[PDB]
Amino acid sequence: AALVVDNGSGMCKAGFAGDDAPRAVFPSIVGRPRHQGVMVGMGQKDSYVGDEAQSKRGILTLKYPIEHGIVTNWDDMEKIWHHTFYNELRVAPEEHPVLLTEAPLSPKANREKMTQIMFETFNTPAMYVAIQAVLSLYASGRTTGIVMDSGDGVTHTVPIYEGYALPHAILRLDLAGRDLTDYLMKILTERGYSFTTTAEREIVRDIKEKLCYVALDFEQEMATAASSSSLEKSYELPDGQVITIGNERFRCPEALFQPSFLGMESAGIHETTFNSIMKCDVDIRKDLYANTVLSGGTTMYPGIADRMQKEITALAPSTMKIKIIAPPERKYSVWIGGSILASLSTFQQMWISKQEYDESGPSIVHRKCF
Amino acid sequence: AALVVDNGSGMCKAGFAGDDAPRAVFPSIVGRPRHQGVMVGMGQKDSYVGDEAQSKRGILTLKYPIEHGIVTNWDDMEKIWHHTFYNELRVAPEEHPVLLTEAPLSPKANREKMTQIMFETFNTPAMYVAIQAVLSLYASGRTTGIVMDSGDGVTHTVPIYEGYALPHAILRLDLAGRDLTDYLMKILTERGYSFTTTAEREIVRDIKEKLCYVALDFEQEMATAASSSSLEKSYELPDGQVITIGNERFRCPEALFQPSFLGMESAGIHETTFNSIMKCDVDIRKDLYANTVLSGGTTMYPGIADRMQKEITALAPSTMKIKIIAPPERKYSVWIGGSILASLSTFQQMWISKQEYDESGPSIVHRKCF
Amino acid sequence: AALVVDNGSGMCKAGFAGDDAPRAVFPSIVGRPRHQGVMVGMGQKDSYVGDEAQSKRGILTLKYPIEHGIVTNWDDMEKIWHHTFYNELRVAPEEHPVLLTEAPLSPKANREKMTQIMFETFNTPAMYVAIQAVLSLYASGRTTGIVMDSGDGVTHTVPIYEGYALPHAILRLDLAGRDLTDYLMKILTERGYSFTTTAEREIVRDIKEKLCYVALDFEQEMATAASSSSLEKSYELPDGQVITIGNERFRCPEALFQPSFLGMESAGIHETTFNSIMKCDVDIRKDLYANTVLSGGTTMYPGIADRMQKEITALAPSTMKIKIIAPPERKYSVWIGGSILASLSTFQQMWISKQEYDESGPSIVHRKCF
Amino acid sequence: AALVVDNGSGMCKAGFAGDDAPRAVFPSIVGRPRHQGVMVGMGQKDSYVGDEAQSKRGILTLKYPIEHGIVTNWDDMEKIWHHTFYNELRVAPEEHPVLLTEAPLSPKANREKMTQIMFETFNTPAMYVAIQAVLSLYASGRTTGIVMDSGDGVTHTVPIYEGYALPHAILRLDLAGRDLTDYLMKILTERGYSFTTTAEREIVRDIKEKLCYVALDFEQEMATAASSSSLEKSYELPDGQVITIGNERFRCPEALFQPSFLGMESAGIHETTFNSIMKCDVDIRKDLYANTVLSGGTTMYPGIADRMQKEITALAPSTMKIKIIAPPERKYSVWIGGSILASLSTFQQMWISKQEYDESGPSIVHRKCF
Amino acid sequence: AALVVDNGSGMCKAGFAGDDAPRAVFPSIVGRPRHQGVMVGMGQKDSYVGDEAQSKRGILTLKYPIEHGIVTNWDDMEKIWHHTFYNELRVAPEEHPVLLTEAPLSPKANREKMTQIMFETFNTPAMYVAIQAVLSLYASGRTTGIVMDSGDGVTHTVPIYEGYALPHAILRLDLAGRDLTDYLMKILTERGYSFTTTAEREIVRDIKEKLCYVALDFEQEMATAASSSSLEKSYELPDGQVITIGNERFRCPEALFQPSFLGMESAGIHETTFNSIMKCDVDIRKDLYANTVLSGGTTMYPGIADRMQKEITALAPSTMKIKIIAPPERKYSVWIGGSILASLSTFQQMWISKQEYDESGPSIVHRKCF
Ligand SMILES: Nc1ncnc2c1ncn2[C@@H]1O[C@H](COP(=O)(O)OP(=O)(O)O)[C@@H](O)[C@H]1O
Ligand SMILES: Nc1ncnc2c1ncn2[C@@H]1O[C@H](COP(=O)(O)OP(=O)(O)O)[C@@H](O)[C@H]1O
Ligand SMILES: Nc1ncnc2c1ncn2[C@@H]1O[C@H](COP(=O)(O)OP(=O)(O)O)[C@@H](O)[C@H]1O
Ligand SMILES: Nc1ncnc2c1ncn2[C@@H]1O[C@H](COP(=O)(O)OP(=O)(O)O)[C@@H](O)[C@H]1O
Ligand SMILES: Nc1ncnc2c1ncn2[C@@H]1O[C@H](COP(=O)(O)OP(=O)(O)O)[C@@H](O)[C@H]1O
Ligand SMILES: [Mg+2]
Ligand SMILES: [Mg+2]
Ligand SMILES: [Mg+2]
Ligand SMILES: [Mg+2]
Ligand SMILES: [Mg+2]
């Protein structure tokens, strides 16, 4: 069987081709102790990865090796891949081909380093690197649609028509889940709550995933939150302290549609999707309007599909049928797509084997790369 | 039964001899993908022909193998004939004789290549190549008349008297439907509408076929369009956008009567018909005036028969009876004529069989050729 | 009943003996197609005769089998006789005796070929060949007179006295209707009108028969035409074009009296008649002067009898009574005479039967031949 | 000195009497701009004449004021005469008598308009209009011969004997160089070459003058061209494109001997010359056979004298000596003859002066007119 | 003196007629603050134009009022014209006539709005709107040539012959400098460089103008860049960071010759120029080949003239002399031409005065408009 590994900026999803869900989903973090050990006989490791770093985060500094979809620390990336293969999946990487994923418009050194590490450090027999938007389209059983994938690092709108990608129409919004976490940390100071460490950043991400939602009309929701108090929710911190948040619940996700809240000049995700559709030929825009596919963890806010539908309907001509496809499993769509791709009989010929890599080099790794 | 195939520059009309209408009418286009395919398992063919190329035109480059009645790409012409025989008519070309059509004054290599392809690629038992104007005269049940056939590539005026052709009086105007489509594309830029790709050219051809008409008096119509706004019509693009056109509606067909709008030096279709009549003997001009037969898709503009009548009446002596015959089925007249010709008992002896072609060669294909 | 057939260079007049007018009068022409037929199922014959050749003359080359009274094409002459017997009179030539006509001083091979064709091709029971001038004298009920017969091919003056012909006084002027048609074609170029084809020659003959007349005094008429414009007439061509002719109207017939207009050296018809009278014995000239009989289509110009009277009065002694007999039916006089001759009880013994022709041969055909 | 101006349908030849060659030979064309001028300060004239119209023909519509020897536009004819006098010869027309030329059997309004324009627009002191065939006979130093002059507009056969013209034997064939140019344009479409504009007509005329020739035996030459490829020649178009022509080289001039190629009913130039000789008296035919003089630019095809000799020898009795006189300067024979005529002391009394024209009018201009 | 204002999509060039260079050349941008001002007493304007917007671009959003040659914001266009007249030229627009420029095939509402604004907002006495290609031809001292003008918005090929425009042969390529800037931004992400804001777009345009060049052979240059490292150049960002670019230097301008790099279907600038030449009459193509004039800032890449020469030589017949005219001042050619045009004595009559505009309206503004 083949291994499917979706490495995002925030979470790593690993599993076996043919399955319907990732077997191992864990934070893509490396934690290192920031205090001196004083007790003899303690199994104090030098670093912690994933959930073990998340459970000991009180005495650790946590670092993401991937930032804005770009690997900034390849040693920590190798640590995370080692943890994936040996601790999470508990398999030998030299026995299975590995399907990895990457975002469009990424540096070529990224894919080249991934291939070099997979072939020289883990000694995988075969290997492939697929584009995440194409996999998200595989997961929904479509060959036409514009995929809006927003994870932890970056957001991308990729239009595909009848299996053909339109790379000139691909748009990138450098704003995703981690920026929303930082913005929530910033606006929680207005209520006197102070989160500053990396562990507190993990706490704020938990708050965001539990309590934040997308308002259908932002100004009406602001007026509602200012008038009464029915939007206030409570959250218990790990030390038993209880915080209460009101309009922040919908002010954090609103930065997805108004990036000026983050001091950014770019347009929201709705205008990004619309502009990506408008860069395509006039004859495919109608099919793209009816197949707008949401993907990633940042699209999991309650009410984001309705808000997206409303905004794109406001931007598009009135005769177009705007249809936002937001499946309940869209947090794993990429991985699911990868699974579907790695189980196709037609795909079993596109693996880059180790012999081809030894005889050609890093130039052969760019297969269906856009 | 015999197969009747009218191959024009724009449309292919195919059917069986004895029928009253073509069974398969489709655009004479070949579409090829201009983007890279990124999805595995998609039935991405190398090329598309006819309506399948028209439905996928968003990701295709469209090419006409025939330009100005001249085949510029014989491989694409064979693709179109294959699509005609196997996908549209769904017959075996080695079982039926084939009646093909050609315009007068065409290169002889055209007919020779057509015969070679029909006898060596499709292995047709018998084959004939008829002149399109004679077929258009068959369709109207006449033996005397001047046929003005204007399709997509070229316009021809062919006078025939009592079944005798006057080849010295045949006139050719290198201006037809595709030139009018290009001119409409050009003059739509005056309103800020930009159509540049081949798919947008198909869109503009649709606009032309739906909204354009021939003004009886051009300057009066221009004054009317400049004064009020009752001539303005709206058209919805495939992406839901709505464009509005005014005088363009009658400025595009006006190039048929004033080719100087296209930068051409030739005379209009009315003066071409009149000059073709005036090259004939004085004793047949009266019968030619009363039997001016319009044929082809470019004669399907509303008001072209009345304008033609008015112009030729202005050119001819006042005692002559100008009568423009414009049947409602004149878009298929050629094909209909071919049908009538291929069902005649007197014609069943004019088929060029494969034995005659093998024993003689390309010299035998010129039968009743003018 | 007997058949009377007057074969002239221009017209064939056929009918039954005893009638007062020819039943079938048609042009003595054979038309052959000069273009290629392109339509299947058309009744395109190989040749056309008479009025059917005249109606289709736009696509035909027209040929007269008789030129200057001499048959130049005996196959076309047989075609014309076949058309006469089967299409015009609609009789069986093997049931009726045939009275044919010939001009005086004609080659003997002409009469011999006529007899051979009538007896071997049409199998007529009896046959006779009469002289046209004697028949013209029969038509006027006279036995004395000088007949001036001018048809399409040749003009002849034949004096007859008390039923006796004076063959030594017979004069021939090789100038008749067809020469006048050619001269009218030539002088119409002075006004910019161009007639060149055989069909246009038929048009010019129609113009001549409708508009030309004989001026009583030629120089006075020329001065009148040069001064004012009251002599100008208009004529509508078959294609609706209108031409205007002035002095040509009387310049074309003037060549009958001044053959030098045609580059001919001979004398006019008046001097020819006078010289023919002066070759006769002095005792019969007075009776010849009073019985000058005009005959043929070329004597049908308005004012030719008055001009003839004036000229012959100027040539003859002042005591002679010049009387020009010009009956209104003199275009058919020959035929009428033939009718009268074929209904005489005294003539029913002069028929050359087929038995006499088989037992004697071509030598018996010269009966009353001069 | 006197001015000699030969105005043909195609070329104007102007010079001074006494010279041996025309000083100014230029195309008889008027060119008018068919596009709008967009640059300020350009010397954009309203019309161009002659070689200046030929050099700017890319942006001009070219018109011949003379068509088939008939002036269809007298304003353009005056433009051409003005260009002749002031730009080409650079003389004052009010100081020299002018000898003009005309074809036989031309409308009288032509000569009258020429005289009116020469006396009222250019104020010439004296003026004469000579027949072109008589001048061509002057150029060869003969008083007996049949001149076959074929230029751009019309062909004429004029027999002259001992200085006497036989106007009744003059024949006109409405087929010359321009018809051959149009026929070459038509038959070049069989090889896919398309020439349609007036500038392209000038290009085709250049092709005809460079590459066309008369085949001695037409069917043998057709067989030779069909078998091998030694008759193929190449020609470089003004834009650098190279066309190749084969049998067309001798199929275009063959229309001079087989006018049915042009859909014409008339006989070839050989049969026209023979028929013109046969209309003359029997005593001068022997001298006419030995003095057949070719004249004009259309007689400049290589091999036309030999073909003419062969055809007329086939038509004439075997005891006659057929001699075709084709001098190498026969393109200018008319002009040369005019020069010789305008330098004769006996001719200095035949000038029509302006006083005679004022006292008599247009009636005096017909001097030796036939 | 007259004012000459060349308003392009990217730069505005303003000056006085008679000068040899524009006095004021500044970016055609309007910048608006995207942050809130917090300091009292700061001269914080509402908007910035030109160089003042370029110097403060760190806190501004920059907008081009012209996009693809089409004015999308007329208020910002008026702001730019006001900045031109009062801040750059420092003149009163009500004292000088203004010569403006426009691209061919532009919407008529563009010229009408320009005239309305110049006559009602700035109250100019006279005004004219010239075509930019004609001005570029004025600047080179020619009346014949095909101008290929590529600026920031659109590329146009306009052939002119002897001062006559051939509007039917004008071609438009919707691809110019701004598309190349966007493509450079896109391909700089392959090296990990991220430029997303409008200020960063200005930075990338600076990089393009400093480091990009046209490779003579693209594949050989790609092989050279892949092998060694001699093509790598460095560029210092405004914050002191240094980026290094290699093949991008010639991959960005290569989109001018291979628009498929941008996902466009159109042909390159070389094929566009060749097709524009081939739409002209055959007689002017030779002069157009020798006078191909480059114009605009997008033609300022090193090596574009040699590449253009090579490509057009490959497309044209081998006997043609391809000559690319690329003067060193071709970035201002249009303006220079305008200067030359506004100083001509012949032009001082083509100004549209305010009285004519008040008495006629927007219909009079179309003078020499094509
Ligand atoms: N229910 C939820 N609501 C809002 N955001 C969520 C939810 N679940 C996950 N996220 C956010 O999704 C982001 C990463 O999700 P994922 O699609 O795995 O991204 P990546 O592929 O970059 O790892 C995180 O920033 C996380 O905060
Ligand atoms: N209703 C219509 N009005 C105007 N033009 C039409 C109409 N229908 C078809 N056409 C034009 O007719 C042209 C081709 O018609 P057709 O006679 O099939 O030509 P061909 O024989 O060359 O294929 C096309 O350019 C199309 O735009
Ligand atoms: N009304 C008329 N006026 C002048 N000529 C006429 C008239 N009718 C007939 N003709 C001429 O008479 C000629 C032939 O008449 P016809 O006596 O039948 O001759 P033929 O006996 O040779 O056939 C024709 O050339 C025709 O032009
Ligand atoms: N060398 C040549 N071969 C064939 N045709 C020629 C040649 N030179 C000239 N011509 C033809 O001669 C014609 C006109 O010649 P010219 O005698 O000047 O006629 P015109 O007197 O009517 O001007 C033109 O149509 C031209 O094509
Ligand atoms: N040296 C250079 N090399 C390449 N491109 C240049 C250079 N200088 C200017 N440009 C480009 O030219 C474009 C605009 O130039 P210009 O001719 O002024 O256009 P416009 O007339 O539309 O303002 C800009 O996109 C700019 O990037
Ligand atoms: Mg992801
Ligand atoms: Mg057709
Ligand atoms: Mg008779
Ligand atoms: Mg001549
Ligand atoms: Mg510009």
PDB file of C-alpha atoms in Angstrom, chain D residues 201-345:
ATOM      1  CA  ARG D 201      -4.598  43.103 -62.516  1.00  0.00           C
ATOM      2  CA  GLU D 202      -1.526  45.197 -63.329  1.00  0.00           C
ATOM      3  CA  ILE D 203       0.620  42.475 -61.742  1.00  0.00           C
ATOM      4  CA  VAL D 204      -1.065  39.836 -63.910  1.00  0.00           C
ATOM      5  CA  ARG D 205      -0.518  41.964 -67.015  1.00  0.00           C
ATOM      6  CA  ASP D 206       3.183  42.064 -66.138  1.00  0.00           C
ATOM      7  CA  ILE D 207       3.166  38.266 -65.753  1.00  0.00           C
ATOM      8  CA  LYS D 208       1.480  37.937 -69.152  1.00  0.00           C
ATOM      9  CA  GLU D 209       3.981  40.224 -70.871  1.00  0.00           C
ATOM     10  CA  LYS D 210       6.922  38.353 -69.352  1.00  0.00           C
ATOM     11  CA  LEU D 211       5.971  34.663 -69.484  1.00  0.00           C
ATOM     12  CA  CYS D 212       3.206  34.014 -72.026  1.00  0.00           C
ATOM     13  CA  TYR D 213       3.881  32.713 -75.531  1.00  0.00           C
ATOM     14  CA  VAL D 214       1.979  31.229 -78.469  1.00  0.00           C
ATOM     15  CA  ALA D 215       2.301  27.485 -79.001  1.00  0.00           C
ATOM     16  CA  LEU D 216       2.776  26.334 -82.585  1.00  0.00           C
ATOM     17  CA  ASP D 217       0.593  23.269 -81.964  1.00  0.00           C
ATOM     18  CA  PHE D 218      -1.685  23.693 -78.968  1.00  0.00           C
ATOM     19  CA  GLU D 219      -2.575  20.060 -78.241  1.00  0.00           C
ATOM     20  CA  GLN D 220       1.036  18.902 -78.551  1.00  0.00           C
ATOM     21  CA  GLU D 221       2.064  21.686 -76.167  1.00  0.00           C
ATOM     22  CA  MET D 222      -0.665  20.654 -73.720  1.00  0.00           C
ATOM     23  CA  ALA D 223       0.595  17.065 -73.843  1.00  0.00           C
ATOM     24  CA  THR D 224       4.161  18.286 -73.285  1.00  0.00           C
ATOM     25  CA  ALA D 225       3.121  20.392 -70.288  1.00  0.00           C
ATOM     26  CA  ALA D 226       1.124  17.488 -68.845  1.00  0.00           C
ATOM     27  CA  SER D 227       3.965  14.977 -69.250  1.00  0.00           C
ATOM     28  CA  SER D 228       7.125  16.699 -68.013  1.00  0.00           C
ATOM     29  CA  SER D 229       7.748  20.049 -66.305  1.00  0.00           C
ATOM     30  CA  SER D 230      10.140  21.923 -68.618  1.00  0.00           C
ATOM     31  CA  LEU D 231       7.547  24.604 -69.455  1.00  0.00           C
ATOM     32  CA  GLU D 232       7.102  25.739 -65.837  1.00  0.00           C
ATOM     33  CA  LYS D 233       8.370  29.243 -65.093  1.00  0.00           C
ATOM     34  CA  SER D 234       8.584  31.196 -61.850  1.00  0.00           C
ATOM     35  CA  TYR D 235       7.645  34.804 -61.159  1.00  0.00           C
ATOM     36  CA  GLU D 236       8.341  36.865 -58.045  1.00  0.00           C
ATOM     37  CA  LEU D 237       5.446  38.980 -56.798  1.00  0.00           C
ATOM     38  CA  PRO D 238       6.078  42.504 -55.442  1.00  0.00           C
ATOM     39  CA  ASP D 239       5.926  41.148 -51.869  1.00  0.00           C
ATOM     40  CA  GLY D 240       8.598  38.510 -52.514  1.00  0.00           C
ATOM     41  CA  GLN D 241       6.213  35.588 -52.976  1.00  0.00           C
ATOM     42  CA  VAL D 242       7.038  33.283 -55.888  1.00  0.00           C
ATOM     43  CA  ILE D 243       4.382  31.745 -58.125  1.00  0.00           C
ATOM     44  CA  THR D 244       4.926  29.030 -60.721  1.00  0.00           C
ATOM     45  CA  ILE D 245       2.937  28.736 -63.940  1.00  0.00           C
ATOM     46  CA  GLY D 246       2.978  25.976 -66.528  1.00  0.00           C
ATOM     47  CA  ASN D 247       0.498  25.529 -69.365  1.00  0.00           C
ATOM     48  CA  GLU D 248      -1.156  28.870 -68.535  1.00  0.00           C
ATOM     49  CA  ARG D 249       1.830  30.446 -70.317  1.00  0.00           C
ATOM     50  CA  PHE D 250       0.411  29.298 -73.644  1.00  0.00           C
ATOM     51  CA  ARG D 251      -3.241  28.921 -72.654  1.00  0.00           C
ATOM     52  CA  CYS D 252      -3.702  32.680 -72.256  1.00  0.00           C
ATOM     53  CA  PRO D 253      -2.537  33.660 -75.791  1.00  0.00           C
ATOM     54  CA  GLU D 254      -4.396  30.670 -77.262  1.00  0.00           C
ATOM     55  CA  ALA D 255      -7.636  32.590 -76.673  1.00  0.00           C
ATOM     56  CA  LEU D 256      -6.534  34.816 -79.568  1.00  0.00           C
ATOM     57  CA  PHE D 257      -6.972  31.805 -81.864  1.00  0.00           C
ATOM     58  CA  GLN D 258      -9.814  30.104 -79.939  1.00  0.00           C
ATOM     59  CA  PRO D 259     -12.061  32.866 -78.548  1.00  0.00           C
ATOM     60  CA  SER D 260     -14.412  30.171 -77.219  1.00  0.00           C
ATOM     61  CA  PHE D 261     -12.002  29.966 -74.268  1.00  0.00           C
ATOM     62  CA  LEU D 262     -13.426  33.375 -73.313  1.00  0.00           C
ATOM     63  CA  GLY D 263     -17.002  32.306 -73.980  1.00  0.00           C
ATOM     64  CA  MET D 264     -16.932  34.306 -77.215  1.00  0.00           C
ATOM     65  CA  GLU D 265     -18.619  33.170 -80.416  1.00  0.00           C
ATOM     66  CA  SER D 266     -16.291  34.965 -82.839  1.00  0.00           C
ATOM     67  CA  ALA D 267     -13.458  33.415 -84.827  1.00  0.00           C
ATOM     68  CA  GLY D 268      -9.775  33.675 -83.995  1.00  0.00           C
ATOM     69  CA  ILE D 269      -7.435  36.316 -85.346  1.00  0.00           C
ATOM     70  CA  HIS D 270      -6.264  33.980 -88.122  1.00  0.00           C
ATOM     71  CA  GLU D 271      -9.797  33.289 -89.345  1.00  0.00           C
ATOM     72  CA  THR D 272     -10.617  36.986 -88.971  1.00  0.00           C
ATOM     73  CA  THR D 273      -7.668  37.934 -91.188  1.00  0.00           C
ATOM     74  CA  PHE D 274      -8.611  35.241 -93.707  1.00  0.00           C
ATOM     75  CA  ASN D 275     -12.267  36.321 -93.798  1.00  0.00           C
ATOM     76  CA  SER D 276     -11.214  39.945 -94.247  1.00  0.00           C
ATOM     77  CA  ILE D 277      -9.036  38.900 -97.189  1.00  0.00           C
ATOM     78  CA  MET D 278     -11.897  36.854 -98.659  1.00  0.00           C
ATOM     79  CA  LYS D 279     -14.219  39.878 -98.576  1.00  0.00           C
ATOM     80  CA  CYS D 280     -11.848  41.665-100.971  1.00  0.00           C
ATOM     81  CA  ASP D 281     -11.856  41.344-104.746  1.00  0.00           C
ATOM     82  CA  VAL D 282     -10.223  38.191-106.102  1.00  0.00           C
ATOM     83  CA  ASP D 283      -7.518  40.188-107.891  1.00  0.00           C
ATOM     84  CA  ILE D 284      -6.017  41.700-104.710  1.00  0.00           C
ATOM     85  CA  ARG D 285      -6.122  38.637-102.438  1.00  0.00           C
ATOM     86  CA  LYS D 286      -2.729  37.412-103.649  1.00  0.00           C
ATOM     87  CA  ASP D 287      -1.082  40.703-102.686  1.00  0.00           C
ATOM     88  CA  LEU D 288      -2.936  40.745 -99.365  1.00  0.00           C
ATOM     89  CA  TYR D 289      -1.719  37.220 -98.552  1.00  0.00           C
ATOM     90  CA  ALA D 290       1.909  38.285 -99.009  1.00  0.00           C
ATOM     91  CA  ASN D 291       1.591  41.478 -96.928  1.00  0.00           C
ATOM     92  CA  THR D 292      -0.139  40.515 -93.679  1.00  0.00           C
ATOM     93  CA  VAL D 293       1.208  43.119 -91.240  1.00  0.00           C
ATOM     94  CA  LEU D 294       0.980  42.569 -87.486  1.00  0.00           C
ATOM     95  CA  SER D 295       0.689  45.596 -85.222  1.00  0.00           C
ATOM     96  CA  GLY D 296       0.153  46.361 -81.552  1.00  0.00           C
ATOM     97  CA  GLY D 297       1.287  45.040 -78.209  1.00  0.00           C
ATOM     98  CA  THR D 298      -0.924  41.945 -78.304  1.00  0.00           C
ATOM     99  CA  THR D 299       1.021  40.737 -81.368  1.00  0.00           C
ATOM    100  CA  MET D 300       4.250  40.723 -79.327  1.00  0.00           C
ATOM    101  CA  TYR D 301       3.847  37.188 -77.987  1.00  0.00           C
ATOM    102  CA  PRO D 302       6.755  34.910 -78.943  1.00  0.00           C
ATOM    103  CA  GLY D 303       5.656  32.562 -81.696  1.00  0.00           C
ATOM    104  CA  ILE D 304       2.562  34.436 -82.856  1.00  0.00           C
ATOM    105  CA  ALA D 305       3.913  35.099 -86.362  1.00  0.00           C
ATOM    106  CA  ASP D 306       4.695  31.414 -86.939  1.00  0.00           C
ATOM    107  CA  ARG D 307       1.305  30.300 -85.615  1.00  0.00           C
ATOM    108  CA  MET D 308      -0.420  32.943 -87.747  1.00  0.00           C
ATOM    109  CA  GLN D 309       1.511  31.797 -90.824  1.00  0.00           C
ATOM    110  CA  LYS D 310       0.590  28.164 -90.160  1.00  0.00           C
ATOM    111  CA  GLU D 311      -3.115  28.868 -89.625  1.00  0.00           C
ATOM    112  CA  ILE D 312      -3.534  31.174 -92.621  1.00  0.00           C
ATOM    113  CA  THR D 313      -1.599  28.698 -94.779  1.00  0.00           C
ATOM    114  CA  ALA D 314      -4.070  26.042 -93.654  1.00  0.00           C
ATOM    115  CA  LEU D 315      -6.981  28.317 -94.605  1.00  0.00           C
ATOM    116  CA  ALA D 316      -5.676  29.709 -97.919  1.00  0.00           C
ATOM    117  CA  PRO D 317      -5.151  27.884-101.231  1.00  0.00           C
ATOM    118  CA  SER D 318      -1.889  25.969-101.420  1.00  0.00           C
ATOM    119  CA  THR D 319      -0.543  28.066-104.315  1.00  0.00           C
ATOM    120  CA  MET D 320      -0.702  31.305-102.307  1.00  0.00           C
ATOM    121  CA  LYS D 321       2.407  32.677-100.593  1.00  0.00           C
ATOM    122  CA  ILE D 322       1.447  33.534 -97.014  1.00  0.00           C
ATOM    123  CA  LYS D 323       3.883  36.067 -95.549  1.00  0.00           C
ATOM    124  CA  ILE D 324       3.369  37.486 -92.053  1.00  0.00           C
ATOM    125  CA  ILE D 325       5.253  40.758 -91.555  1.00  0.00           C
ATOM    126  CA  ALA D 326       6.029  41.163 -87.843  1.00  0.00           C
ATOM    127  CA  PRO D 327       8.692  43.830 -87.343  1.00  0.00           C
ATOM    128  CA  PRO D 328      10.383  43.963 -83.924  1.00  0.00           C
ATOM    129  CA  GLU D 329       9.088  47.523 -83.382  1.00  0.00           C
ATOM    130  CA  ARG D 330       5.443  46.690 -84.121  1.00  0.00           C
ATOM    131  CA  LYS D 331       4.351  47.723 -80.621  1.00  0.00           C
ATOM    132  CA  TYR D 332       4.886  51.344 -81.732  1.00  0.00           C
ATOM    133  CA  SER D 333       4.090  50.954 -85.445  1.00  0.00           C
ATOM    134  CA  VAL D 334       0.991  53.166 -85.276  1.00  0.00           C
ATOM    135  CA  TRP D 335       2.937  55.920 -83.533  1.00  0.00           C
ATOM    136  CA  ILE D 336       5.864  55.515 -85.925  1.00  0.00           C
ATOM    137  CA  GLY D 337       3.464  55.707 -88.845  1.00  0.00           C
ATOM    138  CA  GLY D 338       1.918  58.838 -87.392  1.00  0.00           C
ATOM    139  CA  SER D 339       5.383  60.346 -87.145  1.00  0.00           C
ATOM    140  CA  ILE D 340       6.063  59.512 -90.796  1.00  0.00           C
ATOM    141  CA  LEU D 341       2.675  60.937 -91.731  1.00  0.00           C
ATOM    142  CA  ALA D 342       3.158  64.176 -89.817  1.00  0.00           C
ATOM    143  CA  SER D 343       6.524  64.830 -91.504  1.00  0.00           C
ATOM    144  CA  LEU D 344       5.270  64.523 -95.102  1.00  0.00           C
ATOM    145  CA  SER D 345       5.191  67.685 -97.194  1.00  0.00           C
TER     146      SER D 345
END
